[PDB]
Design a binder for this molecule. Structure first.
Ligand SMILES: Nc1nc2c(ncn2[C@@H]2O[C@H](COP(=O)(O)OP(=O)(O)OP(=O)(O)O)[C@@H](O)[C@H]2O)c(=O)[nH]1
Ligand SMILES: Nc1nc2c(ncn2[C@@H]2O[C@H](COP(=O)(O)OP(=O)(O)OP(=O)(O)O)[C@@H](O)[C@H]2O)c(=O)[nH]1
Ligand SMILES: COc1ccc(/N=N\c2cc(OC)c(OC)c(OC)c2)cc1O
Ligand SMILES: [Ca+2]
Ligand SMILES: [Mg+2]
Ligand SMILES: [Mg+2]
Lengths: 155, 436, 426
C-alpha cells in the first residue's frame, strides 16, 4: 500500500520519497481515516515543494475531508501564504464551506493572518458568507475589536 | 478605689489608646516616665487616679493597660514614642502576621496563636488589683484584628472574669478613611459575637469625627492624627468620672444602670461641645446655656443619626469646668420646652447631671482651643438604630451575591455564621422599633 | 507579611523579569553591583520585600531564574544587572520546549522541576515572614506556560498558606503569528484559574496596539513592548515597596480585589503612555480609566468594574485626588457594580518613577476581561476543530480530554464574568 507511505511522506516533508512513491503507482489521492489526502497534509505542514509536485500529478485541489475542510482551509488556518497562492493558481475554491460554515476567509481572519486575508479578498472571497452562528469575517473583526482586520475587510 | 483595665486591640485601638494615655497623663500631672509630683503617697495609694494607674515602689505610675496587635509596626511606634517608658514592656504584645482585614483570620486561625499569651498577661495585671471592676476594650469594627480578635478575647474574658463589667470604645467605619471593602462584613460578625459579652459600647463613627474636623477645626483633609486627638478628648470626658471624684457614673456598674435599660440595646450616643479650632485662641467663651443647647444638634454627635426621629431612654450630662449648678438647671428647663426631645413613656423624663469643676486639658500639638467649660452628653436614643440600618444595608448588597464570602470560609469559618450574624442584626433593629 | 520570592521562567518571563529588576533597582537607589547609592531613607524602608541583605551591605534580588533553553542565561548575564543575581539561582536545562506546552508541563519541564524547587526552598527558609510568590512568564510558549504552571502547582502544594501572584503575558498574532499559542495559553488559563490567587493579564495585543497606534512606532519590537511592561510592573508593586499610608501586602490586595475565587484576572493600566527616548490630576484620572491606556485589549466601557485600586505617584494634593476619583465614579457610575459598596481604593506615593513627575497606575477587576478570554477561545476552537498539530501534544503524553477540559473551563470563566456584569443590586 504505497498510499499510506505517501500520506506519511507528504506530512514529513520527504520530497524524494514523494517523487519515488508516485513513480511506483502510489495513489496521489489516497486518504487517511478522516479523509485527509497527501495534498491536505503537505498544505497543513508547510511543504510548498510537495504541494506543487502533487498538483502536477493529479491531486484534487478541492478534496474535502470528513469535516468539509479543503487544502485551502488548512493553508489559510495555519498561515502558509505561499501555499495559499499556489492553491488559488491551481483552481482552489476560494469560497469553499466546511461543516462549521467556515470559509478560508473566516479562518485567516480568526487567526490574524492579515496578508492571507488580503490575498483571499483579491481572489474573490465572499465578505457576506456567514458561518453556522451567522457571523461573516467582518462580524469577527467587529466582535473581537481587531481594528487592523476591519480596515482590510472594508477595502 | 476599684481598678479598671484598658485593652487596646489592632491598629485603631492602639493608635486611639496612645492618644488617650497621653491625655490622661496631662490631666493627672504624670510625666512621660511615670513620675507624679502631686502624689504624696509613694509606692501605692487609693486615690481616684489609681483606678487607671498602678504605682511601683520607685514612684512610677504605670497604666493598667494592654496593647495587642497581630502585626508589630503600630505597637513598635508606642515602644519608641515619647511615652515609651510609661508602659509595662510585657503590656505591649505583637504577633508577626496580621488578619488581612479578615474577621475569620483574627478570630479562628491567626488569633488563636496569641490568645493564651494575651490572657496570661491580662491575668498578671488582674492579680495586682485589690477590687477589679472590669475592662475597657478599644477596637475598630472594620479591621480583621479589631473585629475577630476582639470577639475571641471578649468570649474568653466572659469565662475567666464572669462578674466583671466590659465596656467597649468601637470605631464604626466610614468610606472617607476606610481600609477595606469587607469592613461591613467584619462589623456585623464582630457585633453579633460580642453582643452577649459586652455591657455597654460607645460607637465612634469615623464619618462623624471626619466631618467635625472639617467643619469646626477647618482641617481640609483630616488624617488619623486629627481624628484621634478629638476622639481622645471625648473618651477622656466619658472616663473622667472613673478617674476623679464625682457623683455620677462613678463605677462601671453605674454606666449600665444609668444608660442601659435592657441588655441588648447597650449603645449610647455621645455628643460633645464646644469644639473650637486652636487658631481661634481669642474666641468668645460660650455659656452653659449655649454648650448645653449644642448637645441637641446632630452635627456635634459621635455617630451620624437624628435624635429627633427617635426616643430617649436615658440622658446624662457630664460637665467640665466653670459651670454653676443653677445655670445647668435653668438651661435644662429651657431645653425641656422643645418638641425635639421625647422620652419613652416607661422612663422618667429626667436628666442626670455631673460636674467636674476643672476645665478640659489640651494636648500640645492638638487642633483644639482651650475652653473654660465643656460638656459631654451620653444618651440612649432609639435613633442610633439608623447607624445599624446603614451598615446592615451594605452587608446585604454584598452577601446577596456571596461576594468575598470564600475568604472567610477558607479561614475555618462556616458560611452559616454570616446568616446567623445577620438575623441577630435584624432582631437588634426590631428591638429599637419595639421600644419606639 | 514581608518577603516576596520572585521566579522568572522561559524567554518572555526572563526578559520582562530582568527589566523589572533593572527598573525597581533604580527606584530604590541600587546600582548593578548591589550597592545602595540613593538619597532617601524611603528607598530602603521596605527593601527586604524584594532584596536579601548579604554581608558587605549588598542587596541581592530574591530572584530565581528558570528556563529549559540554555541560551537565556547568557542573555540575562549580559544585561546591565546580569551580575546582581545569585549564581546558584539560575536553573537552566539543556534543550528548549519548542513552543510546546506538553514538553514544559510533562516531559523536559517535569525533569527540571525538583531542581528549581530546591532553590525555592532555600530562599523561603531565608525569610522571616514570607508573604508569597511572584511569577513572570508568557502563556504562548512552552516553558513559561507549561513548566511555569507546573512550578505554580508544586509551590502551591508545599506553601498552601502563601499568596501566589503572576504577571502572565497573553499571546497575540500581531506580535507572534505562531498558531499553537492559543493551545498553550488555553491549557495554562485552566491551571491559572485553579492555582493562583491573583494574575495581572499583560496582553501583547494591547501592548502592540499602544506602540503602533498611540506611540506611532510603525514596527514595534520586544523592547518597545517591554518598556510598557516594566512601567506597569513598577506601578502595581509600588505599595509593596514603599511605606505609604497602608502597610500593603499581597493578601490584603487579594481579599479586597477578589470577590469570587475564579475571577482573579486583573486588567492593569498606566498613565501617561510614553516611548523610550521621548500632567494634572484630572487628566491623570481620565487617562488612567481610558481604553487606550489598558494593558489588556479590552474596552472597560463594555463591562463593569467589580473592584479597582489606583496608585498615584508624585507630588499632588491628596484632596485633589479624592475629589477627582469621586468625580470619575459618579459621572461614570454605570461602569461600576452597585452591589459592592466603596469598591474603588486609592493610594498616593510620594516617589514617582524615572523621568516623570506624575504617574497613575490602574488595577481593575473588570467583567470586560471576558473579551480577552473570548479572543483566545475563538482561536483555540478554530485550531482544535481541525485537530491541527494535536499529535505534538498527545505524543508527549497528553490526553485529548485535557484540551476539551481547558476549553470548557475557559468558556465557563467567560459565562461567570457575564453573570456578574448582568447582576443588579435590588
Ligand atoms: N479613628 C481611627 N480609625 C482608625 C485608625 N486606624 C484604623 N482605623 C479604622 O479602622 C478600620 C481598619 O481597621 P484597623 O484597626 O486598621 O485593622 P486591625 O485591627 O489592625 O486589623 P488587621 O490589620 O486587618 O489585622 C478602618 O475603618 C479605619 O478607618 C485610627 O488610628 N483612628
Ligand atoms: N511582551 C513580550 N512578549 C514576549 C517576549 N518574549 C517572548 N514573548 C511572547 O511569548 C510567547 C512565546 O513564549 P516564550 O517565552 O518565547 O517561550 P518559552 O516560555 O521560552 O517556551 P519554549 O521556547 O516553547 O520552551 C509569544 O507570545 C511571544 O510573543 C518579550 O520579551 N516580551
Ligand atoms: C477596592 O478596595 C481595595 C483594593 C485594594 C486594597 N488593599 N490592598 C492594596 C492596595 C493597593 O493600592 C491601592 C496596592 O497596590 C496595588 C497594594 O499592593 C499590593 C495593596 C484595599 C482596598 O480596600
Ligand atoms: Ca500614691
Ligand atoms: Mg492591622
Ligand atoms: Mg523559548
Amino acid at each position: 500500500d504505497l498510499g499510506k507511505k505517501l500520506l506519511e511522506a507528504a506530512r514529513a516533508g520527504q520530497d524524494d520519497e514523494v517523487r519515488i512513491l508516485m513513480a511506483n503507482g502510489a495513489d496521489v489521492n489516497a486518504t487517511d481515516a478522516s479523509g485527509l489526502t497527501p495534498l491536505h497534509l503537505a498544505a497543513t505542514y508547510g511543504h510548498l515543494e510537495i504541494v506543487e509536485v502533487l498538483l502536477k500529478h493529479g491531486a484534487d485541489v478541492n478534496a474535502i475531508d470528513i469535516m468539509g475542510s479543503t487544502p485551502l482551509h488548512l493553508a489559510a488556518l495555519i498561515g502558509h501564504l505561499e501555499i495559499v497562492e499556489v492553491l488559488l493558481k491551481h483552481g482552489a475554491d476560494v469560497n469553499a464551506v466546511d461543516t462549521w460554515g467556515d470559509t478560508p476567509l473566516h479562518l485567516a481572519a480568526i487567526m490574524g493572518h492579515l496578508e492571507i486575508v488580503e490575498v483571499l479578498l483579491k481572489h474573490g472571497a465572499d465578505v457576506n458568507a456567514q458561518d453556522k452562528f451567522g457571523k461573516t469575517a467582518f462580524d469577527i473583526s467587529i466582535d473581537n475589536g481587531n481594528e487592523d482586520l476591519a480596515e482590510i475587510l472594508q477595502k | 478605689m476599684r481598678e479598671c483595665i484598658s485593652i487596646h486591640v489592632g491598629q485603631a485601638g492602639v493608635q486611639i489608646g496612645n492618644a488617650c494615655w497621653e491625655l490622661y497623663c496631662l490631666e493627672h500631672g504624670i510625666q512621660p516616665d511615670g513620675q507624679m509630683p502631686s502624689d504624696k503617697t509613694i509606692g501605692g495609694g487609693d486615690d481616684s487616679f489609681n483606678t487607671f494607674f498602678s504605682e511601683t515602689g520607685a514612684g512610677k505610675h504605670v497604666p493598667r493597660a494592654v496593647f495587642v496587635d497581630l502585626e508589630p509596626t503600630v505597637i513598635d511606634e508606642v515602644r519608641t514614642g515619647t511615652y515609651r517608658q510609661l508602659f509595662h514592656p510585657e503590656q505591649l504584645i505583637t504577633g508577626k502576621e496580621d488578619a488581612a482585614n479578615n474577621y475569620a483570620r483574627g478570630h479562628y486561625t491567626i488569633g488563636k496563636e496569641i490568645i493564651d499569651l494575651v490572657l496570661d498577661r491580662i491575668r498578671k495585671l488582674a492579680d495586682q488589683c485589690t477590687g477589679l471592676q472590669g475592662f475597657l476594650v478599644f477596637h475598630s469594627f472594620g479591621g480583621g484584628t479589631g473585629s475577630g480578635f476582639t470577639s475571641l478575647l471578649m468570649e474568653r474574658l466572659s469565662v475567666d472574669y464572669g462578674k466583671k463589667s466590659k465596656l467597649e470604645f468601637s470605631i464604626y467605619p466610614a468610606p472617607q478613611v476606610s481600609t477595606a471593602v469587607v469592613e461591613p462584613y467584619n462589623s456585623i460578625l464582630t457585633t453579633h459575637t460580642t453582643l452577649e459579652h459586652s455591657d455597654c459600647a460607645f460607637m465612634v463613627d469615623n464619618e462623624a469625627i471626619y466631618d467635625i474636623c472639617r467643619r469646626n477645626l477647618d482641617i481640609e483633609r483630616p488624617t488619623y492624627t486629627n481624628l484621634n486627638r478629638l476622639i481622645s478628648q471625648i473618651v477622656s470626658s466619658i472616663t473622667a468620672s472613673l478617674r476623679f471624684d464625682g457623683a455620677l457614673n462613678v463605677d462601671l456598674t453605674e454606666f449600665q444602670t444609668n444608660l442601659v435599660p435592657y441588655p441588648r440595646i447597650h449603645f449610647p450616643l455621645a455628643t460633645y461641645a464646644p469644639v473650637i479650632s486652636a487658631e481661634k485662641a481669642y474666641h468668645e467663651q460660650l455659656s452653659v446655656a449655649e454648650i448645653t443647647n449644642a448637645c441637641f444638634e446632630p452635627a456635634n454627635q459621635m455617630v451620624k443619626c437624628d435624635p429627633r426621629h427617635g426616643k430617649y431612654m436615658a440622658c446624662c450630662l457630664l460637665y467640665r469646668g466653670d459651670v454653676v449648678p443653677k445655670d445647668v438647671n435653668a438651661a435644662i428647663a429651657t431645653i425641656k420646652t422643645k418638641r425635639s426631645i421625647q422620652f419613652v413613656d416607661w422612663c422618667p423624663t429626667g436628666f442626670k447631671v455631673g460636674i467636674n469643676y476643672q476645665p478640659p486639658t489640651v494636648v500640645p500639638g492638638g487642633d483644639l482651643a482651650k475652653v473654660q467649660r465643656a460638656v459631654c452628653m451620653l444618651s440612649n436614643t432609639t435613633a442610633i438604630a439608623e447607624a445599624w440600618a446603614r451598615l446592615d444595608h451594605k452587608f446585604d448588597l454584598m452577601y446577596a451575591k456571596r461576594a468575598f464570602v470564600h475568604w472567610y470560609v477558607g479561614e475555618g469559618m462556616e458560611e452559616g455564621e454570616f446568616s446567623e450574624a445577620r438575623e441577630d442584626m435584624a432582631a437588634l433593629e426590631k428591638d429599637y422599633e419595639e421600644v419606639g | 507579611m514581608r518577603e516576596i520570592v520572585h521566579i522568572q521562567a522561559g524567554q518572555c518571563g526572563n526578559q520582562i523579569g530582568a527589566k523589572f529588576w533593572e527598573v525597581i533597582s533604580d527606584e530604590h537607589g541600587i546600582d548593578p553591583t548591589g550597592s545602595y547609592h540613593g538619597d532617601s531613607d524611603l528607598q530602603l524602608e521596605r527593601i527586604n520585600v524584594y532584596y536579601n541583605e548579604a554581608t558587605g551591605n549588598k542587596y541581592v534580588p530574591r530572584a530565581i531564574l528558570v528556563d529549559l533553553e540554555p541560551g537565556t542565561m547568557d542573555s540575562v548575564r549580559s544585561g546591565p544587572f546580569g551580575q546582581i543575581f545569585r549564581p546558584d539561582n539560575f536553573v537552566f536545562g539543556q534543550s528548549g520546549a519548542g513552543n510546546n506546552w506538553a514538553k514544559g508541563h510533562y516531559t523536559e519541564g517535569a525533569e527540571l522541576v525538583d531542581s528549581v524547587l530546591d532553590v525555592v526552598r532555600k530562599e523561603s527558609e531565608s525569610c522571616d515572614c514570607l508573604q508569597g510568590f511572584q511569577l513572570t512568564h508568557s502563556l504562548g510558549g512552552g516553558t513559561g506556560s507549561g513548566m511555569g504552571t507546573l512550578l505554580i502547582s508544586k509551590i502551591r502544594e508545599e506553601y498552601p498558606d502563601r499568596i501566589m501572584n503572576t504577571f502572565s503575558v497573553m499571546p497575540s498574532p500581531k506580535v507572534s503569528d505562531t498558531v499553537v499559542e492559543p493551545y498553550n495559553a488555553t491549557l495554562s488559563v485552566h491551571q491559572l484559574v485553579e492555582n493562583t490567587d491573583e494574575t495581572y493579564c499583560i496582553d501583547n495585543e494591547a501592548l502592540y496596539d499602544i506602540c503602533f497606534r498611540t506611540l506611532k512606532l510603525t514596527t514595534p519590537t520586544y523592547g518597545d513592548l517591554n518598556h510598557l511592561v516594566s512601567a506597569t510592573m513598577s506601578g502595581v508593586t509600588t505599595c509593596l515597596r514603599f511605606p505609604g499610608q497602608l502597610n500593603a501586602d499581597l493578601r490584603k490586595l487579594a481579599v479586597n480585589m477578589v470577590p469570587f475565587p475564579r475571577l482573579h484576572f486583573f486588567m492593569p493600566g498606566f498613565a501617561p503612555l510614553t516611548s523610550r527616548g521621548s500632567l494634572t490630576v484630572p487628566e491623570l484620572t481620565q487617562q488612567m480609566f481610558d481604553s487606550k491606556n489598558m494593558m489588556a485589549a479590552c474596552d472597560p466601557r463594555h463591562g463593569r468594574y467589580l473592584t479597582v485600586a489606583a496608585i498615584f505617584r508624585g507630588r499632588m494634593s491628596m484632596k485633589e485626588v479624592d475629589e477627582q476619583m469621586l468625580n470619575v465614579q459618579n459621572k461614570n457610575s454605570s461602569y461600576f457594580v452597585e452591589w459592592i459598596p466603596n469598591n474603588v481604593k486609592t493610594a498616593v506615593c510620594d516617589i514617582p518613577p524615572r523621568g516623570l513627575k506624575m504617574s497613575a497606575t490602574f488595577i481593575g477587576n473588570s467583567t470586560a476581561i471576558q473579551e480577552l478570554f473570548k479572543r483566545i477561545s475563538e482561536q483555540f476552537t478554530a485550531m482544535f476543530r481541525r485537530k491541527a498539530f494535536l499529535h505534538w501534544y498527545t505524543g508527549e503524553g497528553m490526553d485529548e480530554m485535557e484540551f476539551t477540559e481547558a476549553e470548557s473551563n475557559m468558556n465557563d470563566l467567560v459565562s461567570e464574568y457575564q453573570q456578574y456584569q448582568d447582576a443588579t443590586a435590588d
